[PDB]
Design a protein around this ligand. Structure first.
Ligand SMILES: [Zn+2]
Ligand SMILES: [Zn+2]
Ligand SMILES: [Zn+2]
Ligand SMILES: [Zn+2]
Length: 353
């Protein structure tokens, strides 16, 4: 593979981090990688959470290509447990790692007791009071300090840093998180994102991150709408979105998935970014009611790859018998356009400028 030039948010990012970006730039027009949250640490069919097993592997004989985790495994109290070992196992497999922020509420996190008080889901506006000048800026900085120390020590067997796609303040166009759209003006949200990237990169010297932005799906699918809370080309490497749909009567929702994917794909080409579907799944009520769509994955891949823009996403990441759902996923795996962990190669040693 020949040298390419890449422009990242972190102009001093490691060679492997630059290569990851270059890899996705090429790969994304030849496949869509499959990603899964908690791939080797949570599952219905796994007997070890040490990073050696996954539901994906037990279903189709390979791991997800993209491994998703979150800061509940990094920032105290680390309720999901550490993931250093599991990240290293995934990287050793040539996998791609992405971590999303799920920060506690900096304004209320000492008040924890009755869920959701003090967590991401505590809707108490905390953006204004967590920026520099705000009373709770030191609390946010504590979270960012722990993310940075984690990233700065996240090393492979040769002592080299492991690249991570770090996805900040997701689903920010809704109001269920403290960084949401009822909790901040667009400018205040942009400041929260930018401040956090700058703190990690410049104050704490993180060199192994690509930065991802991921609002919810828009129903009015326009660039202007995506741009309202967009942190800016100087601050984002990866353009994503999050979408959760109905188990039944979901043709409209699937068209909307494709439309949003097409939008970020077109914007990504214009702006030198990687377009992705950062999170996709079925809304939580439908899954807890035991409902299922045994054509879900086949609809997903068929809709995406038929669309000339949506097909150019680098990956989609899904977040959590006899009903036909296993066969559906096996078909998705067998599809020529999906890529699982063994289907990707030469991710991290591509020469860049
Ligand atoms: Zn190509
Ligand atoms: Zn988690
Ligand atoms: Zn998300
Ligand atoms: Zn709203």
């Amino acid at each position: 593979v020949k040298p390419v030039t890449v422009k990242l948010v972190d102009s001093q990012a490691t060679m492997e981090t630059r290569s990851l970006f270059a890899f996705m730039q090429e790969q994304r027009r030849h496949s869509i990688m499959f990603g899964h949250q908690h791939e080797t640490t949570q599952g219905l069919t796994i007997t070890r959470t040490d990073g050696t097993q996954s539901d994906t592997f037990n279903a189709v004989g390979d791991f997800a290509a993209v491994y998703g985790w979150d800061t509940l495994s990094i920032v105290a109290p680390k309720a999901e447990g550490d993931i250093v070992a599991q990240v290293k196992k995934a990287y050793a497999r040539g996998g791609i790692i992405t971590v999303s922020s799920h920060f506690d509420n900096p304004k209320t996190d000492t008040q924890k007791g009755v869920w959701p008080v003090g967590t991401s889901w505590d809707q108490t506006p905390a953006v204004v009071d967590s920026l520099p000048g705000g009373a709770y800026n030191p609390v946010l900085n504590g979270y960012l300090d722990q993310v940075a120390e984690w990233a700065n020590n996240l090393k492979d067997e040769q002592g080299r840093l492991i690249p991570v796609i770090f996805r900040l303040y997701h689903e920010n166009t809704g109001s269920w998180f403290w960084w949401g759209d009822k909790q901040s003006t667009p400018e205040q949200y942009k400041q929260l994102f930018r401040y956090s990237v700058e703190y990690l990169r410049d104050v704490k010297g993180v060199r192994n991150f690509l930065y991802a932005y991921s609002p919810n799906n828009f129903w009015d699918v326009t660039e202007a709408n995506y741009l309202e809370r967009y942190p800016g080309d100087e601050w984002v490497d990866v353009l994503g979105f999050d979408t959760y749909g109905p188990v039944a009567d979901n043709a409209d929702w699937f068209r909307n998935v494709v439309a949003n994917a097409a939008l970020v794909a077109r914007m990504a080409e214009a702006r030198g970014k990687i377009p992705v579907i950062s999170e996709i799944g079925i809304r939580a009520p439908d899954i807890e009611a035991g409902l299922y769509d045994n054509q879900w994955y086949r609809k997903l891949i068929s809709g995406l790859k038929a669309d000339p823009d949506a097909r150019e996403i680098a990956f989609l990441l899904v977040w959590r018998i006899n009903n036909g759902t296993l066969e559906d996923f096996q078909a998705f795996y067998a599809d020529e356009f999906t890529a699982f962990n063994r289907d990707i190669e030469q991710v991290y040693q591509r020469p860049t400028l």
